[PDB]
Amino acid sequence: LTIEVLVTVDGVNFRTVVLNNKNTYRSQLGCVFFNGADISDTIPDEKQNGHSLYLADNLTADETKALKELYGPVDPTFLHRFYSLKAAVHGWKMVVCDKVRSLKLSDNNCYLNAVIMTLDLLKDIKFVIPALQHAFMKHKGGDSTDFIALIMAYGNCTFGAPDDASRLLHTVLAKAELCCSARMVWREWCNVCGIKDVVLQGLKACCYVGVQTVEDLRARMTYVCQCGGERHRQLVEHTTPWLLLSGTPNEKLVTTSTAPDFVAFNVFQGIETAVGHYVHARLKGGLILKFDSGTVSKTSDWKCKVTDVLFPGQKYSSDCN
């Protein structure tokens, strides 16, 4: 007995393969998923004749190219991992409180809540990888399974293990590009040795690791110059549609009484308590809304360990003397 199946890695391009009912899918074809399950070690059945199969390895040259076109360059384990993640993340739940989407706590996914709620605030970004852009749109439309499974696949997250929200934000945003101009100019100088400018553009101008405030970002740093004198580093121009700043968890008193310019921030709780818990915070209606994995609390003042902080567009040129 034989069957015909349609094999794809992308859900767009299909090849017809004829199989028997003697050997496994694995022996005949490779690692294959159907309707979310790995069926490699089963024997093909009359029932699946004419059906579509998702192939995870052993790909033809055409499939290798379709893979790169939809997913970018990925490691050889990436389809298996994405297809298994997609199956697993399907049993998670997104809730919406006053139109704000949050991921309910399950399987140590609190870092994913922090990542997704932060990416949801960003304007003028598009993913240069088609699968991610397409999933991002579905997520915006209320269907978040693919986008979450993809972030996990690209981020090398192991289902059920805690992970680093800042690391993931930055890996996800490395796959994105800005749909407008942004620019960041650092000047390094010595009054004897001269001046060097470093210019960053696009998304690179909008993220910075190592400070968590615009005041700190813009401050002058000074250290020993190679001439024996002093050398300085300072931000002299900054123009962006938004600005994300990150550092290691840093205890701070956060207050809305001062109408601060940041719009949102993440918090990591309990470093030594078997390494902790992420909470996403937004500033709205004069209060701090704390979104703790599909739960919300409000306060005007909060002492907490801040990690990432989001600011509105910058339009800065430095001025002195």
Which lies closer to a copy of itself via its Cβ, residue 210 or residue 286?
Answer: 210
Q: Distance between CA atoms of 178 and 162, rounded to whole angstroms?
A: 29
CB under 5 A: which stretch of 6-14, 152-160, 177-185, 187-195 binds Zn ion? Answer: 187-195
320 is in an annotated binding site: no
Provide the 8-state DSSP code for 305: E
- Taking CB under 8 A as the rule, does residue 38 contact a copy of itself? yes
Q: Which residue, 57 or 188, has its beta carbon nearer to Zn ion?
A: 188
Give the span between the Cα atoms of 190 and 193, in whole angstroms.
Answer: 5
266 is an interface residue for a copy of itself by CB under 8 A: no
Instruction: Scan residues 88-147 and list those touching a copy of itself (CB under 8 A).
Output: none
Which stretch, 20-28, 71-79, 183-191, 236-244, contacts Zn ion (CB under 5 A)?
Answer: 183-191
Burial state string for 139-166 with b = 16 or more CB within 10 A and e = fewer than 16: beeeebbbbbbbbbbbbebeeeebbbbb
- Smallest gap from Cβ 58 to a copy of itself, in A, equals 3
Other CB atoms within 10 A of residue 11 CB: 12
CA–centroid distance for 82 within its chain: 15
Q: Any known ligand binding at 190? A: yes
In angstroms, give the least distance from the CB of 26 to a copy of itself: 7
- 3-state SS, residue 249: strand
Selected from 96, 97, 128, 161, the binder of a copy of itself by CB under 8 A is: 161
d(C-alpha 216, C-alpha 241), whole Å: 19
The Cα–Cα gap between 210 and 200 comes to 16
- Token pair listed for 175: 């796959």
Q: Is 40 in the site for a copy of itself (CB under 8 A)?
A: yes
The nearest distance, CB 20 to a copy of itself, in angstroms, is 12
Backbone angles phi, psi at 214, to 5 degrees: -65, -40
Tokens of 59: 């790909």
31 labeled binding residue: no
Q: Segment 204-233, which members bind a copy of itself (CB under 8 A)?
A: 207, 209-211, 221, 223-224, 233
Q: What is the CB neighbour count within 10 angstroms for residue 214?
A: 21
From the list 7, 142, 10, 163, the residue with the least C-alpha distance to 72 is: 10
Shortest reach from residue 61's CB to a copy of itself, in Å: 5
Q: In the complex, what is the shortest distance from the CB of residue 188 to a copy of itself, in angstroms, rounded to a whole number?
A: 6
Of 249 and 294, CB closest to a copy of itself: 249
203, amino acid identity: L
Q: Is 207 annotated as a binding residue?
A: no
Which residue among 100, 190, 200, 263 contacts Zn ion (CB under 5 A)?
190
Q: Which of 282, 287, 249, 288 is nearest to 267 (CA)?
A: 249
Do the Cβ atoms of 153 and 315 come closer than 8 Å? no
Segment 223-242, which members bind Zn ion (CB under 5 A)?
225, 227, 229
Residue ranges that bind Zn ion, judged by CB under 5 A: 190, 192-193, 225, 227, 229
Residue ranges that bind a copy of itself, judged by CB under 8 A: 4, 7, 15-18, 26, 30-31, 38, 40-41, 56-61, 75-77, 80-81, 155-156, 158, 161-164, 166-167, 170-171, 174, 186, 188, 196, 198, 207, 209-211, 221, 223-224, 233, 246-248, 250-251
